[PDB]
Amino acid sequence: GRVTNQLQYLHKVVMKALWKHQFAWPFRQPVDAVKLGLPDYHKIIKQPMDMGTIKRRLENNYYWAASECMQDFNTMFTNCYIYNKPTDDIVLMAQTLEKIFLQKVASMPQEEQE
Amino acid sequence: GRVTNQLQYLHKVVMKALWKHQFAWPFRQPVDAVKLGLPDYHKIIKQPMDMGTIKRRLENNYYWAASECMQDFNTMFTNCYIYNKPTDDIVLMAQTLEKIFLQKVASMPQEE
């Protein structure tokens, strides 16, 4: 439970950009395995992650460190690559979003503090 | 070339930690589909990436920005998750290495 300059950057710069992205819609809420017809989803993916969860954690001071937040972003993207077929559009969508995520992390301010 | 603080950090902290990790050996050279009996590998993975290539690139000043090297690390990890079965050990190895990657990149100096 902490607010830092990096957490504020992850929230207000990085997440804000990804959230509004045209490929973001599948990732803004938990995967709904019922609605989507995916009865094996929770057998394969043991740690579901989504932007809504990450955003709410940033608003509620759940994270102590930027790295913790970056790990949740990574789990979200990795779940997608692991669950889905190589040829699924969703995989391309996740790669596109993940490249922005990495690009933005490369300009995160580096006085990890608060 | 002079080497930005970020690329120096990627070389001396990130690659340093990953290259010597005990889970690193599958990733140190390009995947050999012949040796590994993986006829579909190059059909699924269109951009192979490996730590030997990235390390070479870091030594020979191939990179113009940190994000470029970081993209290569990401491609290497993602290749693995896309090609391999969810239950393969290699996936667990990749995840562990990628966690270190992200942890270190969290503390990377600022650009410029």
Residue written as tokens 């992650």? A49
Per-residue three-class SS string for B5-60: HHHHHHHHHHHHHHHCCCCCHHHCCCCCHHHHCCCCHHHHCCCCCCHHHHHHHHHC
Overall domain count for chain A:
1
Q: Which residues contact A1 (CB under 8 A, 6 or more apart)?
A: A61, A62, A64
Q: State how far the Cα of B67 lies from the Cα of A73, in Å rounded to an integer.
A: 17
What resolution (Å)?
2.0
Residue written as tokens 């690329």? B7
User: How far does the CA of residue B12 sit from the closest CA of chain A (Å)?
Assistant: 17
Q: State how far the Cα of B94 lies from the Cα of A102, in Å rounded to an integer.
A: 17
Q: State how far the Cα of B108 lies from the Cα of B103, in Å rounded to an integer.
A: 9
CATH number, domain with residue B94: 1.20.920.10
CB contact under 8 A, B107 and A110: yes
DSSP letters for A2-69: ---HHHHHIIIIIIHHHHTSTT-GGGSS---HHHHT-TTHHHH-SS---HHHHHHHHHTT--SSHHHH
Q: Do A76 and A51 touch, CB atoms closer than 8 A?
A: yes
Residue B72 among known ligand-binding residues: no
Residue B85 among known ligand-binding residues: yes
CB contact under 8 A, B82 and A78: no
The CA-atom distances, in angstroms, between A68 and each of A6, A10, B23, B84 are 11, 11, 22, 26
Which residue type is seen at A42?
H
Nearest to B91 among A82, A99, A107 (CB): A82
Residue A105, chain B, CB below 8 Å: the answer is yes
Residue written as tokens 């290699």? B90
Enter the tokens of residue A11.
């929230």
Can you say whether the dihedral through the CA atoms of A34, B81, B21, A98 is positive or negative? negative
In degrees, to the nearest 5, what angle opens at C-alpha B92 toward C-alphas A32 and A6? 70
Q: State how far the Cα of A98 lies from the Cα of B78, in Å rounded to an integer.
A: 10
Q: State how far the Cα of A96 lies from the Cα of A33, in Å rounded to an integer.
A: 23
Residue B85, chain A, CB below 8 Å: the answer is no
Q: State how far the Cα of B102 lies from the Cα of A78, in Å rounded to an integer.
A: 13
Mark A46-67 as b/e (b = at least 16 C-beta within 10 Å): eeebbbebbbebbeeebbebbb
User: How far does the CA of residue B58 sit from the closest CA of chain A (Å)?
Assistant: 17
Expressed as residue numbers, the domain containing A78 is 1-114
Question: Considering all CA atoms of chain A, what is the largest pairwise distance in Å, rounded to the nearest integer?
Answer: 45
Q: State how far the Cα of B86 lies from the Cα of A103, in Å rounded to an integer.
A: 27
Q: State how far the Cα of B29 lies from the Cα of B52, in Å rounded to an integer.
A: 5
